[PDB]
Write a sequence for this structure.
């Protein structure tokens, strides 16, 4: 296991498409909970946010939400499975940019959006993908794509790694590989965010 | 402090006095306090002057209390965030002269039945304004002239019957406009101008589809992907792109964006 305390605002974006079974989705949410504990959201150092995205964006936890750990883990665990036909990564990103990271009430902590993707949105919806990804950059928001399975929008994952250097991506064959390279994902975040006290 | 929780996070000093059954501001709060949470307490009245000692305060939360009166005295030159939502205030406070640096104002779910002329004078740094869940029927002209930098405006769930034709003028940075769940039946011609508007919620309204709704319809077709639906649920708050939510008579039987208007010039 890998744990660490750091100044961070981490946003979990979860693919709500039918490319993942309900049961698989339950594994994805379990990964989010572990992540919350690993980064220790129990401290005022890390702020977490959780958004599920299919046609639209569904936020169950906001960064400035003031609730105790046990409560947040619950919400995260209760995020509803959508099993939707469409999961627009451009929508959730547009949402992250305008509705989550609009301002910078913490120019000290790192801002990271972990975009857990398992599908490929229709091209007709990706007209402003790069525009939004670029916007996130202008606001010091690092986007880390996590391709899950064979249907992850690889063109977009590449396009994200490209827009910024620190935008490193992870590719897992299935949600089961999640808990596999978790330490690897956590380790990379502790190297991106400034330190906090234990 | 023996009443509230204090925790310094970098260059910020946060004081949490959430749900402490407080009936008045706790005395002897750290002098460097930059963020104060007084939400969900038993405060029937509050005076801003009592915070002057904290020359570092930048955020103040007085939401979900029992506020029936708010005194606007002295000045908190560094405060940019004020949450007054979920109280019993019967009128909008005039803060332009007491809160110069204000960037976010929330007075949602109170008892506002109108907004005063020149209500936001002096609030030139205001970027966000939430007035959701009150009883506004109409808005005064020039309401947002003083706040040119506005990015997010919410008037959702009031009882608005119409909007001033020039309401959004000068707002070249507006990205979120929430006007859902009101009593609107038409949009004045040229209302939106040429400015791009990332998020606009227009559902829950009795749109009167006739020749006059044509301006709105052309706007809708050109902005189908910027028209959103706001859904609320248990722990979940969603925003979904869907132009068809905007409909005639408020019935899904016919979207406004696809209204013919046979003989309209």
């Amino acid at each position: 296991d890998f744990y660490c305390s750091r100044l961070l605002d981490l946003v979990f974006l979860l693919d709500g498409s039918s490319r993942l079974s309900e049961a698989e989705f339950e594994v994805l949410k379990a990964f989010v909970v572990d992540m919350m504990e690993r980064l220790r959201i129990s401290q005022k150092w890390v702020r977490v946010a959780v958004v599920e995205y299919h046609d639209g964006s569904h936020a169950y936890i906001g960064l400035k939400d003031r609730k105790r750990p046990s409560e947040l883990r619950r919400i995260a665990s209760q995020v509803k499975y959508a099993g939707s036909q469409v999961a627009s990564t451009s929508e959730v990103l547009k949402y992250t940019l305008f509705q989550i990271f609009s301002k910078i009430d913490r120019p000290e902590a790192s801002r990271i959006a972990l975009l857990l993707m398992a599908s490929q949105e229709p091209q007709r919806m990706s007209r402003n993908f790069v525009r939004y990804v670029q916007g996130l950059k202008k606001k010091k928001v690092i986007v880390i794509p996590v391709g899950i399975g064979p249907h992850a929008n690889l063109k977009q994952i590449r396009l994200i790694e490209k827009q910024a250097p620190e935008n490193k991506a992870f590719v897992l064959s299935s949600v089961d590989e999640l808990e596999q390279q978790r330490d690897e994902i956590v380790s990379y975040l502790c190297d991106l965010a400034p330190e906090a006290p234990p | 402090h023996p009443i509230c929780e204090v925790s310094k996070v970098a260059s910020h000093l946060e004081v949490n006095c959430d749900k402490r059954d407080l009936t008045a501001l706790p005395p002897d709060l750290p002098k460097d306090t930059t963020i104060l949470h007084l939400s969900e307490n038993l405060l029937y009245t509050f005076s801003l002057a009592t915070l002057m000692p904290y020359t570092r305060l930048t955020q103040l939360n007085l939401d979900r209390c029992e506020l029936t009166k708010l005194q606007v005295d002295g000045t908190l030159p560094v405060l940019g965030t004020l949450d007054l939502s979920h109280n019993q205030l019967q009128s909008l406070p005039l803060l332009g002269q007491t809160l110069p640096a204000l960037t976010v104002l929330d007075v949602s779910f109170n008892r506002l039945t109108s907004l005063p002329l020149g209500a936001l004078r002096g609030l030139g740094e205001l970027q966000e304004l939430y007035l959701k869940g009150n009883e506004l029927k109409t808005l005064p002209p020039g309401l947002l002239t003083p706040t040119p930098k506005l990015e997010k405006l919410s008037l959702a769930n009031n009882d608005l019957t119409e909007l001033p034709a020039g309401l959004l003028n000068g707002l070249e940075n507006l990205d979120t406009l929430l006007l859902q769940e009101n009593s609107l039946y038409t949009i004045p011609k040229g209302f939106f101008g040429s400015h791009l508007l990332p998020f606009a919620f227009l559902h829950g309204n009795p749109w009167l589809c006739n020749c006059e709704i044509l301006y709105f319809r052309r706007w809708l077709q050109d902005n189908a992907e910027n028209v959103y639906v706001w859904k609320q649920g248990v722990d979940v708050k969603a925003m979904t792109s869907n132009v068809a939510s905007v409909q005639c008579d408020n019935s899904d039987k016919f979207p406004v964006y696809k209204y013919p208007g046979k003989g309209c010039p």
Notes: Chain B has one domain: 1-265. The longest helix of chain B spans residues 214-222.
